[PDB]
Design brief:
One of its GO terms (cellular component) is plasma membrane. With about 375 residues, this protein is an all-alpha fold. It has helices at about 5-15, 25-30, 40-65, 70-90, 90-120, 125-155, 160-180, 190-200, 205-230, 240-260, 270-290, 295-325, 330-350, 360-385. The chain has two domains: about 1-180, Growth Hormone, Chain: A (Up-down Bundle); about 195-385, Up-down Bundle (Growth Hormone, Chain: A), CATH 1.20.1250. The protein is globular and about 55 Å long. Bound molecules: the ligand Cc1ncc(C[n+]2csc(CCO)c2C)c(N)n1.
Amino acid sequence: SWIYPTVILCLFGFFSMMRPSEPFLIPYLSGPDKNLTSAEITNEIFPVWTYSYLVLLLPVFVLTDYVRYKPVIILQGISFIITWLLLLFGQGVKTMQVVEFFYGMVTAAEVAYYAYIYSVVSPEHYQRVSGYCRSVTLAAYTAGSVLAQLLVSLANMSYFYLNVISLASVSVAFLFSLFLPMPKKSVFVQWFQDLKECYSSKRLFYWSLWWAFATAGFNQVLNYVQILWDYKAPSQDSSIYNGAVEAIATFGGAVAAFAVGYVKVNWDLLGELALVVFSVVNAGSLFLMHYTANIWACYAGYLIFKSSYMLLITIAVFQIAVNLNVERYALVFGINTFIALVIQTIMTVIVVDQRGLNLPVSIQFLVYGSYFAVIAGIFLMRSMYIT
Ligand SMILES: Cc1ncc(C[n+]2csc(CCO)c2C)c(N)n1
């Protein structure tokens, strides 16, 4: 039944997302072993990841369903070993840009990871599958965070050995991906025409429209929430307080994802209400993070925002999967992720980049909260127009 593929994919998504080095990527790169500078990391290394993410997302949503979702997962696994093997023993900006290219490949094939299990289980399980899988990834993340924060604070473990542990983790995920059950088989304009058949499904464009826009803002908030926390209360100890808080925010999000899979509720007649309510919650949390000048209130707002968004995206992925009525699960997921990345890149250029308005982190989260309020109101107004 659904138990074996779900268990194997959950193990893969745990041991692949359980990375102790992820919280300490910036200190590792600009440290005594990697020996880089923040100018080179932010300007010459990090944008390579976004460029590679877009470029390698293109074939992910073009070719994942045709190859039956397994080689792209195995490609993600192999890119996981390559990324961390180069990150362990790579020097200078030239090798770190290759690391970012392979991490872009990894994040692009995450779409295949998400769509594979929908390609393997029957639709009646799509809800449970939607929660568990997503949940475990978030669980992995918080586990990794703890596995970092404990070790660096209790075992005096260096960041290099954190990356060694991360490589050991993602190599186990590669072995688990090797044992995934293989899904069963089955001009330019024609492809687009098929896309027209794929996005004509019921409530799929609306859920995809939320996915394309909400997750761009979610990624922006994830990027700049640490900056907002540092601005709200500048402390040297915040390194041990910020990431730990994120671990609580991720775990809560994990719980929210587990709420979708476990709790049996008809999401067809409750999808719009959940979307509007939890988008209002997202906007209210984001406004709470900025407007209130309390670090604990901002922490609670971020926890609520991440939890609400993870619950909503679990619902979105589930509802897109069941209503798709075509086998092209990764085409829709990949296109949603690509549009989300394009929107996030445009918003990053506009609101925070020096080439744009260069808004400080104080006004940045007011902008993000208003962005999510616009999303909520557009979906709130649509419900009123329907009724
Ligand atoms: C190996 C690796 N992991 C994650 C990121 C993404 N990332 C890490 S911190 C951050 C936010 C900066 O404001 C970005 C873009 C990357 N580039 N390389």
